[PDB]
Amino acid sequence: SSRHGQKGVCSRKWPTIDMPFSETGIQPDIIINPHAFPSRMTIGMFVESLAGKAGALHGIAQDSTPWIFNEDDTPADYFGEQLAKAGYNYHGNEPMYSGATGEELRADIYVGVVYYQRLRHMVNDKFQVRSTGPVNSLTMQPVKGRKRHGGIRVGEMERDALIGHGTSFLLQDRLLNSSDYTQASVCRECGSILTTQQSVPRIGSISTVCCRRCSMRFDSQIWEDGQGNKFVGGNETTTVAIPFVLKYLDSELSAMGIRLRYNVEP
């Protein structure tokens, strides 16, 4: 930024050969678009460019304290007199040449010397990319934090916009498939996702998925527990695809004494 609020990021490091060169052989080190000026109306930057060039030529320092000029004694007049005396033109325009083609440009370019400040808002503390990483403990969603390999949040307004496109698959991929997708187990009859468990096996058997709500204390349909509580019960469970935050919400509601039956279709 300059001292007039004309902030702006740097797009590309333009090579000096492709930079436009003036008739005196000097290529500017900062290029600012002329379209930044008409809306802001920072004419002080133009006056500073004029006075900076004049002072650099004459070896003097130009004071820019406000209200040292008036309508009769214009800074444009003053610094233009200095530039014309130094041999450059009154209006601060320099005939420049295209650095890529070589021909002289249509009109004289406005050049000068202005004081520039570098701000601490650098892109090296802004960029962040996540493919996988540390997930949360209860929601099993990506953690928050640039330094933690954490993901970004697609929130309420982003979801509403993603619906407005009619792209329900974009919504699925954002909010479920890439955030907390899980292939849990659900009881067909109980309709509950949490009261199921992986039964411990016996010698040679294979662990299966059972349920505790639709089971009563006690050969083929006998499944045991780690703590020795063997009993026959729910042997009819499926695997649906749900967000894990749904399972956390189910646990929280069960803490409130509320039940949610999940009616599995087939």
Partner 1 sequence: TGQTPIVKANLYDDYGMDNFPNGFNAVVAVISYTGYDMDDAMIINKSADERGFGYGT
Partner 2 sequence: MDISKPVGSEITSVDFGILTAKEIRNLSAKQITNPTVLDHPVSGGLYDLALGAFLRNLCSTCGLDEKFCPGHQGHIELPVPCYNPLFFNQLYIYLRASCLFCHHFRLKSVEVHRYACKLRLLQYGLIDESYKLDEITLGSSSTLLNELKSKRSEYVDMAIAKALSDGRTTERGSFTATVNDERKKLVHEFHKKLLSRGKCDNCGMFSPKFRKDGFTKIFETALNEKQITNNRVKGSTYILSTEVKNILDTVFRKEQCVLQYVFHSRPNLSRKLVKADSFFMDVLVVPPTRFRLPSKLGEEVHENSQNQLLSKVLTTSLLIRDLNDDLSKLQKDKVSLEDRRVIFSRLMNAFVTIQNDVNAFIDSTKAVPIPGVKQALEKKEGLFRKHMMGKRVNYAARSVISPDPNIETNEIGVPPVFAVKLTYPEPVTAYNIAELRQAVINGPDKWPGATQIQNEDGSLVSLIGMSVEQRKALANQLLTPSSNVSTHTLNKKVYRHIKNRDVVLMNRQPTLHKASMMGHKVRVLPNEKTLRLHYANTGAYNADFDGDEMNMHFPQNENARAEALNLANTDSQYLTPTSGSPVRGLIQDHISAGVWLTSKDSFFTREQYQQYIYGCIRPEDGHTTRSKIVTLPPTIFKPYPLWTGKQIITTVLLNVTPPDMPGINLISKNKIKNEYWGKGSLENEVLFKDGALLCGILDKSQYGASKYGIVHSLHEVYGPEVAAKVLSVLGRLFTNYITATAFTCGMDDLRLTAEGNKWRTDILKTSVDTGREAAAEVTNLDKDTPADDPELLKRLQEILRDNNKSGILDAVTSSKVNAITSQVVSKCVPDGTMKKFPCNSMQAMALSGAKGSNVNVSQIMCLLGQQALEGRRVPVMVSGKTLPSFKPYETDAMAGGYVKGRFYSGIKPQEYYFHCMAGREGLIDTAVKTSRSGYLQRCLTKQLEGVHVSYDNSIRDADGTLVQFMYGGDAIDITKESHMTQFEFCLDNYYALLKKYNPSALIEHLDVESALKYSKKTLKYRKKHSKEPHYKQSVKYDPVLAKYNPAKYLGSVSENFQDKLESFLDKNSKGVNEKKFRALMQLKYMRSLINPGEAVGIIASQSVGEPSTQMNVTLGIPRLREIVMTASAAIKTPQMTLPIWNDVSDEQADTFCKSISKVLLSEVIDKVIVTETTGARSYVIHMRFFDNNEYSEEYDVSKEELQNVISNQFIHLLEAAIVKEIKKQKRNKVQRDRQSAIISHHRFITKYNFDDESGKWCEFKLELAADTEKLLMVNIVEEICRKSIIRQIPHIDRCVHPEPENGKRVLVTEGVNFQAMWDQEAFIDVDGITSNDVAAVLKTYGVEAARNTIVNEINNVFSRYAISVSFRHLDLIADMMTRQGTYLAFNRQGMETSTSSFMKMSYETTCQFLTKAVLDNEREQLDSPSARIVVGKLNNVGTGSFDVLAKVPNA
Partner 3 sequence: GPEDFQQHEQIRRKTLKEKAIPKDQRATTPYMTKYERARILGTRALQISMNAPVFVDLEGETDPLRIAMKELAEKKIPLVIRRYLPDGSFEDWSVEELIVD
Partner RNA sequence: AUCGAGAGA
**Residue 62 interface partner, choices partner 1, Zn ion, RNA, none, CB cut-off 5-8 Å depending on type:** partner 1
What's the one-letter identity of residue 93? N
- Binding flag, residue 230, Zn ion (CB under 5 A): no
Q: Which is nearer to partner 2, 183 or 220 (CB)?
A: 183
Q: Which has the closest alpha carbon to 146: 127, 124, 174, 131?
A: 127
The span from the CA of 258 to the CA of 110, in Å, is 74
Of the listed pieces 5-13, 53-61, 151-159, 199-207, which binds DNA according to CB under 7 A?
A: 151-159
**Residue 125 interface partner, choices partner 1, DNA, RNA, none, CB cut-off 5-8 Å depending on type:** DNA
- Binding flag, residue 160, DNA (CB under 7 A): no
**Residue 106 interface partner, choices RNA, DNA, partner 1, none, CB cut-off 5-8 Å depending on type:** none
- Sign of the Cα torsion 75, 80, 82, 83 reads positive
Contact 19, 99 (CB under 8 A): yes
- Binding flag, residue 84, partner 2 (CB under 8 A): no
End-to-end CA distance of the chain: 65
> Least distance to DNA from the beta carbon of 24, Å?
44
The span from the CA of 200 to the CA of 230, in Å, is 9
What is the number of alpha carbons within 13 Å of residue 64 lying toward its C-beta?
Answer: 19
Residue list 185-214, contact with Zn ion (CB under 5 A): 187, 190, 211, 213-214
Phi, psi of 140 (to 5 degrees): 55, 35
- Give the one residue of 58, 91, 130, 144 binding RNA; rule: CB under 7 A: 144
Radius of gyration of the chain (CA): 36
CA angle 83, 85, 86 (to 5 degrees): 65
Residue 72, burial from CB neighbour count under 10 angstroms (0-12, 13-18, 19+): exposed
> Least distance to partner 3 from the beta carbon of 53, Å?
56
- Binding flag, residue 120, DNA (CB under 7 A): no
Q: Which is nearer to partner 1, 13 or 217 (CB)?
A: 13
- Binding flag, residue 166, partner 3 (CB under 8 A): yes
Task: Give the x-and-dash track for 23-62 against partner 1 (CB under 8 A).
Answer: ---xxxxxxxxxxxx--------x-xx-xx--xx----xx
What are the residues binding partner 3 (CB under 8 A)? 166-167, 169
What are the residues binding RNA (CB under 7 A)? 7, 121, 144
What are the residues binding DNA (CB under 7 A)? 125, 128, 144-147, 152-153, 155, 157
